[PDB]
Each structure stands twice: as C-alpha cells, then as structure tokens.
C-alpha cells in the first residue's frame, strides 16, 4: 500500500481565491480603480502577482514606474496577509479533514506540496498542522510546477520515495509534476482541464482513504 499522501493546498485542502480577491479589491479601491469584482478575480486563478497587478492597472489603462509597480505588488501582499487572518477550519474542503484523520490513524505519512509561501500559516489557521509530517518549502525548489521538484521534496521530507506516494492536485501543471516525480496522481476537477489519462474525482468529498486504497491497488495491475 502507499506510504504517503502529498497534498496540494489551493483547490484541494482549501481555496485562497476569496482572500486574494479581497486583497486586490482593497488595493484597487485605495488607488481608485473600478472593476475588481469576483468575476475579474476568477481570471487571476494561477496568475502571478506581477501579471495580476498588470491586469488591474489595465482596467484603467494605467502605467506606473518600475518602483511604483514593485510597491503596489508589496501592498497587495500586505493586504493578502491581513485578509488570511480570517481563514478558519470552516475553509477546509469537504472530506479533507476525515481523510487526514484516517491517514494519520493508519500511520500513513502526510506532506504538503504547495506553491503557497503562506502554507504553514494557512494550515495553522485551519487547525490542520498536527496532521502534517512535513511541508515542502516552495522557496527551496529550483523549478515550480509542472517541474516535479516540490513533490520529490515532499516525499523525501517524510522518508519515502515518490513511487510510494499518492499526489492530490487540482491543476494540470500539478498533475504533470506528480507524474514526473514518480508518484500516483489523483486529480480533482474535470478531464478537460487535467488530462484524460489519470484518475479524477469531481470534488474532494470523493477523496476517502477507501477510494485512495482502491485506486492504488487498481493501478498496480
Ligand atoms: F497549493 Be497548490 F500549489 F495549488
Ligand atoms: Mg492547487
């Protein structure tokens, strides 16, 4: 049986989108730019801070200096840190808490393989820290997803080879990283987005220990 589960954070454990939305909306209002609504922020999913800021300035056809741009990006991050203080166990996605409990009670290792530089804090806010055996530090990988670096690091940090592990991901780049690490991917979402050659569940309530075990056994035949 698999010895570890490597968890992505955003789109698997929780969603940070509302908090990023709040942060951009606060910044936009401060500098007097209309149009930063929930719909607009949906289009920033997966998009870098710098590219996102440019999209906000584009709402007002606005140009700024390199220094001003840097300062605005910093201010957005300061806003985001404020907004995520309100993260709580209510933010945890369905099924995830029960899965973490079942993995730990069965002595299966649990690691975080997230791009979030606020991962440890977010886990603390959601009361999940005690379930995690390791957190792979994104600041430490030479290459981001789809590079497998972060999943390899997560597996190694809990004393396992990636080949002994399952990775859970909501993004196509994430699924690729899991595949190229040697771990077994189980995606959450749709094949149109993630690919047609992996096991996918429609939402996280399907991520049960029983299901993960069935998939593991089915995949080594
Ligand atoms: F937290 Be993962 F990188 F979406
Ligand atoms: Mg994700």
Swiss-Prot record:
Binding sites annotated in the UniProt record for Mg(2+): 8, 10, 170
Species of provenance: Lactococcus lactis subsp. lactis (strain IL1403)
Binding site for beta-D-glucose 6-phosphate: 10, 46-47, 49, 116-118
Job of this protein: Catalyzes the interconversion of D-glucose 1-phosphate (G1P) and D-glucose 6-phosphate (G6P), forming beta-D-glucose 1,6-(bis)phosphate (beta-G16P) as an intermediate. The beta-phosphoglucomutase (Beta-PGM) acts on the beta-C(1) anomer of G1P. Glucose or lactose are used in preference to maltose, which is only utilized after glucose or lactose has been exhausted. It plays a key role in the regulation of the flow of carbohydrate intermediates in glycolysis and the formation of the sugar nucleotide UDP-glucose.
Database matches in NCBIfam families: bPGM (TIGR01990), HAD-SF-IA-v3 (TIGR01509), PGMB-YQAB-SF (TIGR02009)
Record protein name field: Beta-phosphoglucomutase
Cofactor(s) needed by this chain: Mg(2+)
Subcellular localization: Cytoplasm
PANTHER family: 6-PHOSPHOGLUCONATE PHOSPHATASE (PTHR46193), HEXITOL PHOSPHATASE B (PTHR46193:SF18)
């Amino acid at each position: 049986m698999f010895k570890a589960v490597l968890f992505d954070l955003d789109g698997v454990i929780t969603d940070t989108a509302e908090y990023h939305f709040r942060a951009w909306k606060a910044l936009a209002e401060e500098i007097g730019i209309n149009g930063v609504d929930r719909q607009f922020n949906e289009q920033l999913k997966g998009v870098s801070r710098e590219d996102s800021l440019q999209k906000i300035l584009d709402l007002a056809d606005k140009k700024v200096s390199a220094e001003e741009f840097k300062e605005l990006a910093k201010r957005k991050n300061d806003n985001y840190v404020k907004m995520i203080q309100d993260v709580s166990p209510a933010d945890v996605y369905p099924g995830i808490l029960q899965l973490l409990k079942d993995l730990r009670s069965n002595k299966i290792k649990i690691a975080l393989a997230s791009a979030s530089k606020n991962g440890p804090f977010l886990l603390e806010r959601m009361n999940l820290t005690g379930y995690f055996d390791a957190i792979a530090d994104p600041a430490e990988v030479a290459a981001s997803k789809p590079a497998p670096d972060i999943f390899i690091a997560a597996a190694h940090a809990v004393g396992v080879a990636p080949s002994e592990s399952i990775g859970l991901e909501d993004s196509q780049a994430g699924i690729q990283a899991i595949k190229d690490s040697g771990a077994l991917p189980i995606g959450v979402g749709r094949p149109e987005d993630l690919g047609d050659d992996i096991v996918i569940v429609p939402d996280t309530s399907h991520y049960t220990l029983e299901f993960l075990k069935e998939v593991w056994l089915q995949k080594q035949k």
